[PDB]
Design a protein around this ligand. Structure first.
Ligand SMILES: Nc1nc2c(ncn2[C@@H]2O[C@H](COP(=O)(O)OP(=O)(O)O)[C@@H](O)[C@H]2O)c(=O)[nH]1
Ligand SMILES: Nc1nc2c(ncn2[C@@H]2O[C@H](COP(=O)(O)OP(=O)(O)O)[C@@H](O)[C@H]2O)c(=O)[nH]1
Ligand SMILES: Nc1nc2c(ncn2[C@@H]2O[C@H](COP(=O)(O)OP(=O)(O)O)[C@@H](O)[C@H]2O)c(=O)[nH]1
Ligand SMILES: CN1C(=O)CC[C@H]1C(=O)NCc1cccc(C(F)(F)F)c1Cl
Ligand SMILES: CN1C(=O)CC[C@H]1C(=O)NCc1cccc(C(F)(F)F)c1Cl
Ligand SMILES: CN1C(=O)CC[C@H]1C(=O)NCc1cccc(C(F)(F)F)c1Cl
Ligand SMILES: *[C@@H]1O[C@H](CO)[C@@H](O)[C@H](O)[C@H]1NC(C)=O
Ligand SMILES: *[C@@H]1O[C@H](CO)[C@@H](O)[C@H](O)[C@H]1NC(C)=O
Ligand SMILES: *[C@@H]1O[C@H](CO)[C@@H](O)[C@H](O)[C@H]1NC(C)=O
Ligand SMILES: *[C@@H]1O[C@H](CO)[C@@H](O)[C@H](O)[C@H]1NC(C)=O
Ligand SMILES: *[C@@H]1O[C@H](CO)[C@@H](O)[C@H](O)[C@H]1NC(C)=O
Ligand SMILES: *[C@@H]1O[C@H](CO)[C@@H](O)[C@H](O)[C@H]1NC(C)=O
Ligand code: NA
Ligand SMILES: [Zn+2]
Ligand SMILES: [Zn+2]
Ligand SMILES: [Zn+2]
Ligand SMILES: [Zn+2]
Ligand SMILES: [Zn+2]
Ligand SMILES: [Zn+2]
Lengths: 555, 555, 555
């Protein structure tokens, strides 16, 4: 009970003083260790990594001049005139505009854009809502001008929807505008927070990839040129540009590095279909009361929407992550054992000696793997009731008959051949007949016919002299003195009298013959004695008034 | 030194030619492999997965008609009249509105909403700021109309806060409005970028779950109906609807699949308490100068705020992730070994033979596990100074006394029984008395009394003939020729003279008796000779002028 | 073929009935299990964790009074007067403002801010765009007032850019404003969704860290005070405050817990340089038509932008994650085996007996590890052609010469010493001369001179009596009867006639001598017989008309 808990099992091992195998094992161990360490260090798998939460504050600086008309109108544009109040992750800068002043909710012809003309009142629908014209049709075609006529619509009039964006863009000088971006990032799980601007930074700096990669002041034209985009062309219809701020932050004290990396990427497709609203624009309405009427000035503003995308992760050493990674990678250190054991098993096979070695003599010295295999593995078979081992004096090996005997004599059955183990030279360094019989000394079995084929076995497969004729048979098997000595060794105070001693001697003779002709006790316990030897043993130690049971299954 | 590095250790193994165990091992191996592969493939654990960074551009199309009043006013609503300039992840569409025109900062009665009436000036507070009424009270109750009176407040007047949203919603036609959503997603780590619109897409399409799941043009009424929401009812007070875009993107070349999946989800609670601002609405102010006074038109706009939620991950094959997963799952392949070893150990126990097997004869053939266990494990015990082994000729087994002898004779002590190993039949296949004594040949020990109980041992536990009477005792133990032969085998040129040869012969006799009666050298080295045999051996090889040391601890 | 699949290999093990080792093994197993379970439970490594998608709806309540001027103007501020229409993840509350009314696009002096004065027309540039002044210079210095003069610029006039924010802040009462935040979070992968407000919540509550941590109604002054921020001071120039909502949500049914945690964090740097736009402010333009001219009222609004940051993860039990973690941590259970095997190997070394044990007698009882090591490991060496084993009767050990013999006699070579294994006492418990010769019975080798040093070996290293003189040599080696008995044991029907029997007897004598003097068959197969014994054996069984081949490499 208590002693059961107080046990430790250690595997039995064979150590081989081999230069090749030791070198291979150490090389594989070092390779596995190097790869594991490189991965752990390269991927920071010892670090628990967290995503950041970001806040962005943008400030746009720049002044623009316009001289556009029917009178020549001079106009000044400041931040309040081309920027919306929003100053977060996205900010919009106007680069072009179409103005429709003094709009009133009434009837008017629709602008003739992209084949919008009509040639009859019936052609244009009545009550149809046209998002393109932004008005409700009255079913009449009215003259937009002298030459072309367009359908009447109830809408904000005059209606200029469909008018092409002015070219060149009016606010081209927006390329010279600057934007200051303040980014505050926090890793809430790591209890860390930082910002893209730190004390001691130059305030007159402008961002550059190489000279000033940390300056958070960006020129829009420089942003466009950094990625091969033409600000002048994009200004006509507008677009979307993304300013990516990447935070590859290491929060370990010994390797602390939390710096932003700035990049730019056009976010709107350059080749958008004309029907899918290419570019970026929106309509801005200014409502005012004139006299006693409500009027609207509509601005179709085209510009570049700057999306500030902030992403990244913060890594900090975690014991659990390192433990998990080490546990995952531990099993890879058995690669050396697996490979060397596979080599030993493969080179132990006889196939390589018969075929591979004669063809290639370089792989000859690896025949030593047979010795390693025989010192490493001990093959055994299932001890089932049908297991039987037979040895013939003429033949040098043993046969394993594990099949049921369905009347056919055991001699006739073939079985499968197995080798004879060496008989422990260390301990050995001391001083008419039945049809199936081929020795002339066998007799028919006295067992029931249903189980008689077991004892229908001869000492040899071909005619010749019986094994009993050898003097060793009498010395080992029939020598009463030797069997008595063995029994006394097992039972020092044994009583050498009665039929019990005869039965003990018969069993000892059976065991002696089995050990002599089969060597291993595993095979001896399942061996089958030949009829000649069995009956000679019984004739030396006859049973008075009983019937012989014969071989019995140990299990 | 150098040879120490050049070593390889391989485990000693026993292979069993068993159909059941091999089948179980292969079945378990295949099960583990199948589950591991299914997980790896199902969860793409070989892929490093990254979150996307998204940009959204929305374009709303639609025109609305209103005919509302005291004169009947006809009104046209376009995108600039019901959409805010923002066009990013969220866009708002107006569905209803309450208008208060020509507001001036002055005194006025507060709107009588939800029991806001007063019956006395003292009842209403003075200087109290009421966010519900949005004004500062003057402490007076003034007549809002003929029948009801409300407290005076300084505020934008006339004040209509508390007025119920018009029913039915004025801008019901907003259900017919359409929205085009352009989504650009990037996996910065995988250096990949894509968009929800690709060349060759239909431009007249409208989104449908089955017919057109990839059309990025959505009808708001269709959005509401897809999830069983009534646009007409929600339009009265407004709400929030989320358009989820999911990107389950695989970036492997052989399995490249990066497509958006569109879904809809109401984000505002349908059953919000009346005091928690049900629905979605906000107040929009238009300031204008009339004559020489600043006036404000307040619009309480109720509508649906459409939140475009973009989420997803991009997976790309990574060697490190696959290696980590394989290392994690490698240890699961030892399940077959664990289970089969457990079966062997459990079925080797004697308990099953005495109890389980007689009750159930189906589990009988599994008695072979005893052979496997005896061929697999070699039990040993700690060789401590108190370890002692005693054998009695009458008894068939050996006793292990590992307890200290506190004066009690070793014969009296019981110990614990252990079996006798087989005596290597292969090598064996050759040619008055003290109170505790039960054989009549033992003598009292000559050791100091403090350690005399060790030698107070007899050859048997019950009266009878001494083991010395057996001839094997003289042949093995007292045979001078045999001991000399053994010594010469160990020392070929040994000098057979002097008392040294006598001591060598005595030690050899002790060893011979221990091996004969204990077999295993592990037990023999810790065996204890009976007093009778010990003193007979000493009488055959007496020590001239010395005192016998007795048993000595090997370690 | 089929039987190859039907095999199972089980490791051979030695179990040790040791209290110390069993206790250590169980303690280490329990430690590993406890740590693994604690990690799994603490880190919820059995849970697949997902990030949330969030929607935020904000409602600000509050009314503010202002009495500011040249006439004293009384002003009322409501939500529409200090909040923008946006009500999502960020909302802005105005706390101070600078008003410039009736602006017109024309020429005017620039505001004299921070040394903006000029003393000459030439000093100021012409056509230079100044984002600070927000105007285009005309190259003239004009009198801003009686005492100071500033450069003329085309811009919105009058220009007040550079004017300091009023102190104290006009909208200080904003500290008393309240904000209601509704947060809807969804874990799309876990198919879960929840909100920060649930039925039964108090509607008159205000948020507090301890009393009401779940109230989603926050007072701005309370927000600032919770983290030691002064709302009154920040109101002058503005700032950014982040309201963090953390969702540590467990979606397991038995441990369901999805509740928000509210926190506050200032997001704008308190010590920003004066040139980097300290605080938070933006310019808001109101355009109106007066008479027939377009005029603009500019509001420089300073305030606090409240960024609502929502983050968190939802964890739900996943079988794959648990399986992966268990597989990763399984290999850690071999720590007990590794440590105990290391202890056994280290304490088996002889070094500790000679040096460590005499110095420290407490580590003496651990000498038992030698027995465990000898019962655990079986050292073997590579059987290479150069492997040779030599034994000298005078010496008690064996020498392994694995080096090539380059003419030097094998006797002269030293080799390396190795111990002699015990000769299986169980099986043993039965009945002039050449210059290099030191026994007088050796003879020169008859082999070719290129391979003659192999047989140039004597039975001893020093002069003395030859091993052949011992009677055991004749009994074991030269005894024809014993060799015949061995051969009959191997070949029962062997023919004892001809020269074949002589060769068999010579080989058996060689084997007998090798086994006697080397014991282990591994060393015996590579042993080298002394010239004296070799030639005595050959003289007993001479070869008639042949030349002796000598030692042959088994592999
Ligand atoms: N291996 C083996 N054992 C045998 C054989 N014959 C008998 N035995 C053993 O001897 C015992 C039966 O002895 P036997 O003289 O045949 O019958 P008994 O006189 O009734 O005891 C059984 O336990 C068998 O295991 C045989 O041919 N081979
Ligand atoms: N196993 C065992 N060994 C013994 C016993 N008695 C003596 N020995 C061994 O014999 C040696 C002592 O021999 P002994 O004749 O008793 O004393 P000595 O004459 O001084 O050598 C010691 O090394 C013991 O290990 C015994 O009862 N059992
Ligand atoms: N271990 C060992 N084996 C030897 C030695 N000499 C001969 N043999 C073995 O005996 C066989 C050769 O016998 P030998 O009488 O020398 O030559 P043969 O008469 O032609 O057979 C070879 O297979 C050797 O393995 C020796 O010194 N040591
Ligand atoms: C064409 N303009 C004039 O003649 C006078 C100035 C200009 C105009 O009306 N500015 C209004 C305004 C204010 C903020 C943001 C925007 C945005 F849409 F660009 F983002 C806009 Cl348009
Ligand atoms: C009631 N109305 C009229 O009589 C004339 C048109 C309409 C009105 O005033 N539009 C102002 C406006 C412009 C953009 C966005 C919005 C939003 F709040 F809905 F988002 C709004 Cl209200
Ligand atoms: C100074 N004021 C007056 O004299 C009359 C009221 C006030 C004013 O003009 N409100 C305009 C307005 C409307 C919404 C949001 C904002 C924001 F910028 F603060 F966000 C603003 Cl400024
Ligand atoms: C930007 O500024 C430079 C230098 O003042 C000027 O040469 C250039 O014309 C400007 N760009 C535009 C579009 O006006
Ligand atoms: C950029 O676009 C403008 C107008 O579209 C054009 O005049 C100019 O040549 C373009 N520049 C480049 C480098 O393409
Ligand atoms: C939407 O359009 C259809 C077809 O023109 C029309 O029948 C329906 O009344 C419209 N919905 C509303 C709310 O006007
Ligand atoms: C939707 O709401 C409107 C007005 O609230 C109602 O008339 C109509 O019957 C509702 N439809 C459904 C399907 O509930
Ligand atoms: C906030 O309200 C309290 C109580 O009404 C008042 O004492 C305090 O002065 C108010 N704060 C400001 C800045 O007016
Ligand atoms: C907060 O700031 C105001 C004005 O800047 C000042 O009067 C007051 O003393 C400050 N309070 C604290 C606690 O610092
Ligand atoms: Na493992
Ligand atoms: Zn026969
Ligand atoms: Zn025969
Ligand atoms: Zn006795
Ligand atoms: Zn006795
Ligand atoms: Zn010699
Ligand atoms: Zn010699």
């Amino acid at each position: 009970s208590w002693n059961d808990v107080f046990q430790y099992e250690t595997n039995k091992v064979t150590r081989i003083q081999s230069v090749n195998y030791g070198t291979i094992k150490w090389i594989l161990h070092m390779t596995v260790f190097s790869y594991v360490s490189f991965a752990l260090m390269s991927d920071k798998l010892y670090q628990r990594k967290e995503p950041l939460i970001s806040s962005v504050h943008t400030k746009v600086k720049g002044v623009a001049e316009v001289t556009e008309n029917t009178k020549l109108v001079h106009g000044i544009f400041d931040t309040a005139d081309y920027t919306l109040p929003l100053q977060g992750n996205s900010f919009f800068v106007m680069t072009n505009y179409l103005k429709s002043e003094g709009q009133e909710q009434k009837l008017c012809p629709e602008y003739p854009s992209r084949g919008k003309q009509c040639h009859s009142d019936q052609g244009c629908i009545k009550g149809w809502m046209d998002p393109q014209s932004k008005g409700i049709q009255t079913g009449r075609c009215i003259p937009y001008d002298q030459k072309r006529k367009t359908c009447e619509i109830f809408a904000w009039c005059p209606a200029e929807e469909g008018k092409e964006a002015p070219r060149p863009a009016l606010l081209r000088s927006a390329e010279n505008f600057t934007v200051l971006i303040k980014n505050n990032i926090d890793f809430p799980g790591h209890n860390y927070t930082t910002r893209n601007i730190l004390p001691g930074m130059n305030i007159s700096c402008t961002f550059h990839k190489t000279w000033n990669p940390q300056c958070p002041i960006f020129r829009l034209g420089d942003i466009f040129q950094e990625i091969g985009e033409n600000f002048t062309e994009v200004a006509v219809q507008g677009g979307i540009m993304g300013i990516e701020i990447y935070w590859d932050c290491n929060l370990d004290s010994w390797s602390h590095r939390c710096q932003p990396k700035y990049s730019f990427r056009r976010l709107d497709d350059k080749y958008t279909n004309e029907s899918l609203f290419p570019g970026y624009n929106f309509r801005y309405a200014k409502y005012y009361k004139e006299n006693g009427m409500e009027k609207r000035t509509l601005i179709k503003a085209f510009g570049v929407r700057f999306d500030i995308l902030v992403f990244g992760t913060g890594g900090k050493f975690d014991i659990i992550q390192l433990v998990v990674y080490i546990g995952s990678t531990l099993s890879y250190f058995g690669l050396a054992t697996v490979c060397i054991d596979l080599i030993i098993n493969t080179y132990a096979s006889t196939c390589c000696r018969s075929r591979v070695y004669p063809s290639c003599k370089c792989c000859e010295p690896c025949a030593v793997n047979e010795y390693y295999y025989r010192k490493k593995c001990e093959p055994i078979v299932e001890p089932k009731p049908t297991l039987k081992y037979v040895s013939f004096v003429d033949e040098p090996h043993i046969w394993m008959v594990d099949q049921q005997l369905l009347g056919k004599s055991l001699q006739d059955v073939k079985g499968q051949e197995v080798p004879r183990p060496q008989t422990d030279f260390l301990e050995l360094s001391r001083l008419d007949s039945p049809d199936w019989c081929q020795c002339g000394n066998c007799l028919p079995s006295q067992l029931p016919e249903n189980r008689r084929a077991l004892e229908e076995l001869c000492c040899r497969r071909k005619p010749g002299q019986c094994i009993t004729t050898s003097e060793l048979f009498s010395k080992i098997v029939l020598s009463r003195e030797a069997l008595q000595l063995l029994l006394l060794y097992q039972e020092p105070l044994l009583a050498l009298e009665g039929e019990a001693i005869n039965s003990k001697l018969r069993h000892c003779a059976y065991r002696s013959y089995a050990t002599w002709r089969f060597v291993s006790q595993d095979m001896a316990d399942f061996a089958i004695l030949p009829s000649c030897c069995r009956w000679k043993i019984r004739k030396e130690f006859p049973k008075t008034q009983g019937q012989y049971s014969g071989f019995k299954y140990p299990y």
